[PDB]
Symmetry: C3
Subunit: 82 residues, 3 copies
């Protein structure tokens, strides 16, 4: 069997992963209060422009590429269009 | 491109999120020990009739709208049909 | 409103769940440092051949059957092809 480590960088206690129809992978980087994504084949993550996250701990992405995050430290759910 | 906050009422320590093909958003809630959902365009959530949960954590939804939840404290996975 | 408890066995503090097209359900069995899946029909529980996981806490599955896990304890995200 083969498992592959994805080239995210500087993750801290990550918690939550989603993958869209394009194979882009989204991760709630819980310990760094941010959400990062990696397109299929890409070597470098991008940080999603959410605002004021605290201990985010879950992520989902819909068919339109809208990203939903459980912003746990703030007791709320936020979403960001593609 | 600015984030929006979803109108869940009384959310306390969300643990996970999923979104179906219709854009309905499902969230697991630690403090209230329950799972809630919000249709796209709605600002009144519904509480899903799971019972005997001890901290729902993960949530997923399939193409048939069946909702799956990891019941963390009871070491089990429960589902409800649409 | 009847909920169904799936025939997973031996879970410990499960905290992430995903479901694929074949109706296969994947769970991050966090307390056992593993990811399990349940095949529809036969209800054969199989442990996915990830290795070196530590307190995993998020799982996702793409349209190709590739499984993605946030390996929280190791600050990384790992994937496994079908």
């Amino acid at each position: 069997n083969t498992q592959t480590v994805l080239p995210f960088t500087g993750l801290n206690t990550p918690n939550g992963v989603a993958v869209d129809s394009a194979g882009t992978v989204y991760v709630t980087d819980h310990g760094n209060n941010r959400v990062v994504k990696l397109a299929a084949g890409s070597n470098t993550q991008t940080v999603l422009p959410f605002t004021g996250l605290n201990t985010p701990n879950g992520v989902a992405v819909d068919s339109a590429g809208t990203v939903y995050v459980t912003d746990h430290g703030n007791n709320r759910v936020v979403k960001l269009a593609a």
